[PDB]
Hints:
The structure is cut from a larger assembly and holds one copy of chain A, three copies of chain B and two copies of chain E.
Chain A: H1 6-30, H2 41-71, H3 82-118, H4 129-156, E1 164-165, H5 166-189, H6 196-203, H7 208-222, H8 224-228
Helix pairs in contact in A: 1-3, 2-4, 3-4, 3-7, 4-5, 5-6, 5-7
Chain B: H1 10-13, E1 18-22, E2 26-28, E3 32-40, E4 55-60, E5 66-73, E6 81-82, E7 89-98, E8 102-112, E9 116-128, E10 137-139, E11 145-147, H2 154-175, H3 180-188, H4 198-225, E12 236-237, E13 250-260, E14 265-274, E15 280-287, E16 290-293, E17 309-310, E18 314-316, E19 327-335, H5 338-341, E20 354-363, E21 368-376, E22 378-380
Parallel strand pairs in B: 2-9, 6-12, 13-22, 16-17
Antiparallel strand pairs in B: 1-3, 3-7, 4-8, 5-7, 8-9, 10-11, 13-14, 14-19, 15-16, 15-20, 18-19, 20-21
Chain E: H1 6-42, H2 51-59, H3 62-73, H4 80-100, H5 108-111, H6 117-130, H7 133-146, H8 148-156, E1 162-165, E2 168-171, H9 172-179, H10 204-229, E3 235-236
Helix pairs in contact in E: 1-2, 1-4, 2-10, 3-4, 3-10, 4-6, 6-7, 7-10
PDB class: oxidoreductase
Keywords: monooxygenase, oxidoreductase
Entry title: Particulate methane monooxygenase in 0.02% DDM
Amino acid sequence: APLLDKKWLTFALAIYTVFYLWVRWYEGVYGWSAGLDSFAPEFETYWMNFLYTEIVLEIVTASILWGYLWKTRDRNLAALTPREELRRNFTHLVWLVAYAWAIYWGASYFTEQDGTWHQTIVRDTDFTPSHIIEFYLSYPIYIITGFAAFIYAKTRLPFFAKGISLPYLVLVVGPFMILPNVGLNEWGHTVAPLHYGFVIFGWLALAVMGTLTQTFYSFAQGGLGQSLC
Amino acid sequence: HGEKSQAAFMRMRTIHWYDLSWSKEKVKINETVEIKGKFHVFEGWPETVDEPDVAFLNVGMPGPVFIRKESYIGGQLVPRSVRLEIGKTYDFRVVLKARRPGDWHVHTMMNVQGGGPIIGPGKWITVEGSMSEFRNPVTTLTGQTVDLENYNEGNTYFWHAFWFAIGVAWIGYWSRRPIFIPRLLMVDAGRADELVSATDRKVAMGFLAATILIVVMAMSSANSKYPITIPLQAGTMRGMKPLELPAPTVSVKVEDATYRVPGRAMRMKLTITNHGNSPIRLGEFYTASVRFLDSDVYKDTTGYPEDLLAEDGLSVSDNSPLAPGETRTVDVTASDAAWEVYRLSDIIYDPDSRFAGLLFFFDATGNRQVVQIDAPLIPSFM
Amino acid sequence: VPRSVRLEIGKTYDFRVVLKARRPGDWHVHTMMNVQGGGPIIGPGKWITVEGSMSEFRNPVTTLTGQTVDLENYNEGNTYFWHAFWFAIGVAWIGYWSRRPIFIPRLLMVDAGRADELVSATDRKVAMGFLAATILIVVMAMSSANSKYPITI
Amino acid sequence: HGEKSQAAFMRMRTIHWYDLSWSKEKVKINETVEIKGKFHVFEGWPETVDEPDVAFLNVGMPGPVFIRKESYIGGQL
Amino acid sequence: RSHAEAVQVSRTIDWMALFVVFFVIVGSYHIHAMLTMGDWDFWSDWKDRRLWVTVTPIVLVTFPAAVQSYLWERYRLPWGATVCVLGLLLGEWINRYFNFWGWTYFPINFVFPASLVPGAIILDTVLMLSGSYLFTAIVGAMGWGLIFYPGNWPIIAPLHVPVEYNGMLMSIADIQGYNYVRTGTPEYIRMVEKGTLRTFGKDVAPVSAFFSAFMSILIYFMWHFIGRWFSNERFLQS
Amino acid sequence: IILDTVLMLSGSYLFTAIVGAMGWGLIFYPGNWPIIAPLHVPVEYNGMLMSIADIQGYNYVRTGTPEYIRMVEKGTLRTFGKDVAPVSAFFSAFMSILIYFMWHFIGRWFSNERFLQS
Ligand SMILES: [Cu+2]
Ligand SMILES: [Cu+2]
Ligand SMILES: [Cu+2]
Ligand SMILES: [Cu+2]
Ligand SMILES: [Cu+2]
């Protein structure tokens, strides 16, 4: 069995790319056709239904994934073969890759796609197509990925199971608080301070600098270290 | 597309667009449409909106589906912000050029520093053709004729790609050697000197010197290629000419304003006094983008939007010709579906339940007088 | 003018205030103008004598819903009822824990590492019941208030 | 000594001094010189300059080489 | 567990770690930059001499400082600022070509972003050659603030050509912004140079740049310590 | 009681600082609405539309607080009609998640037991 399982990394990259490309195509085709007027029946047909279905599906997927990851926690962690530890570390780094890619798609692409939408329409509704896709789709997706990665690290890696990693907890918690910020974004709308909450909680993502370090140390704990001389 | 959700009192008591006229309703990819008309900054301006001391005549469109060739407020071109006065009528004219094919909702709008957008009536315009046929030529003072759609597209791509390639090469130079993990192991082991060699220092010095030299030479070349440059022009124009409208000869006093709120209708009681020398009949009532007409007195020929035009909405109990010098009290009902569609009923949710509007009085000969109505609005639930 | 107003520097305006007497005594009443950036501007004052009893004062108004209400005693029972109900809930919540030993042996056991023996499953069930009851009561009270007063502005 | 370096648009569109007259061009250590004239606050005032709601009639001199005995705008001191 | 093949395991891990660092930096730096200075980058109407060169370099030391501290102290990797700059540029360009032009059809020469690479390589070289974070925080930050406007001038100069549009003097960037109507941003929102009675004509572009440089020397330093905090490795127990 | 139950059941100060603070911010206005609703009844006072609370404040003269001091909703051109009461509440909730957390650490400072010698 190969040390790194290529198919899971390929699956993560492909599923994220394909789903987000489909979402972008749907936005390009229907946002111009039905998303312009928030009181039209087509807006409810194509965008509010999207929001409701997306919310229910996100809750179901998050609950199922977190439950499955917690239910398969390794009860005894001292009997692990170091090769198995290295394999689990590779899987955790794949989880980190997926979380980074989701962060890119969520905070870099659609957040600015939404800046693009505001310099083309007059007002900032709570449920514009840009908000439906950015606030309620991508942000929860990367939050789910981050929490699942943290749970995987805690319940399957011997180095991370000895306590709650402060950099990891900050990396999975701060980036989340950007979601609660929305309230201030709206309260302010009804480079400006009304947005400095996304700035503050966007910084906590830099906590990856700590988390990655821990990850490397785990790779060095098995035997990689001495062999790398 | 954005006015149906603004406070129905703000919409009523901000600006009062009227006499509007859209030249064409079907343009091509290089044709122009002119949106002329007049606006009246209401005297009882809302108080959570700053006065129009820094305003801007914008156009409400779904992105650049048309380009504003020229915009005039009072005869003068306003390519900048403007200072308007609370209580005056101004004249405006926007000449747009069509970019994208499709059916678009274009609206004139005024943006105000302290309140935001004030959106006027919107019209559907059909653009036929292909986007690739659009051309935007201008002639600079230096003597060059340039198309703004493709001007400076090669230069930006070239310079950004050059800098990105330099950065990628700089990272890839270090990415050819072993990277994070044995580097971290050697750093923790105290071997912080063995990782960096003299060749790396020489390469870094060369990179820094080349970057500085390239930046300086590029700036010199850009200066030589474009010797005549001017700074970015920004300012606010103060001296806009208002319209000198004659004082109306009609006086209207509002005694009771009541609206049902299982309702589409609005009711007022008006005491009207005529001071002119001609008999007069009330022909229209203007509210926040909605015109209530009376077919007996006045008809519409300008081509107002269908959803905002109430052909028979206005009903007056005693709309007989009003003799000069006579005062009389009438009950006026403005009823149209646009009251429900455009969410003028949501005034029930507003903290200030006052309404403003314009009445138009037409004499027998055809002369028209504009009167202002400002009064509190009262709901009726039973 | 039941609200604020914008005046112009240099003009004469006319004003009229109609007041209704509440309390008996000799009072100094003055008209005054309050300004956003300066504060109070007090005019001349006059001594007015009010005779009678305060209990005879009545302030009736008629709402658009068709109800006639006296503003002095309107919504006095409801406020007392709800505030007393919430205070009783809070007092019961504190007194549930106040029936057991309180600060000092609790601190001694906490410092001794016995942080689990203090809280039992019954306390967790009681807390869950309290939280569910609070949420349900708040929601039901809001629904009942909406039903009782459907027309609000 | 300080106007040659101000924005040549500010200078044009702020105040329009005219009808100016300086009594003498050679005074002694206890004599007086009167600078009379009129100004027109332009209607298209620049927008990065606040309106003359709090102004002051000053004199531009290299330090107290002269003392302002009296300054009048409209007849009033 | 391994057998002289550790080399491969390293290389692999390196590639995945490079991916993770690059894209987390992309997301965080892009949201921060857009959320602080986005309006100046969005339009060529805002690329002025006073507030563009003042605000853009001051705000953008934040993430390069922290990433430089982490990647230099622990791995002796000098590309700390360059990777942040490249990630921000990649994110802005992707959105601009696919959303500004692809969705709302604003022209590319109207929505192009600012260039930041030369200053990034300046900062990285300054840190590597001297190996001192204080010498860097002074000299490299000052140079970063100074090199911002000369770096962008070759892209910006052809847009600042005088023109007479309907009787009024304008620049080509001004005509671009006036013609291509943005319903969200009127003209008065433009935080651009407008001129004052204390502003000296030809000394606005340099002085502002110098101001930016000075502020960089502050912000970098501050964020350096922030970069030393997020690089922790503590395991809280609750 | 929501906050206290949230802290006791989970035993985590961070889970509390998020969930309980958000719930505390959200439950504020529904908790007061039964007391406040009868005061928000429409009325026509001398030709102008008012609420019963507004008439109370207008009739019962407070010489210290004029009307303009009232930091109340006045409406804007960006304010959506029926979405003011919820959105503001949500804003409060978010800010609670901050302030609670901060003050938690302050609560860990005043709980010291040090004996300075000067
Ligand atoms: Cu948005
Ligand atoms: Cu529209
Ligand atoms: Cu008007
Ligand atoms: Cu001089
Ligand atoms: Cu003048």
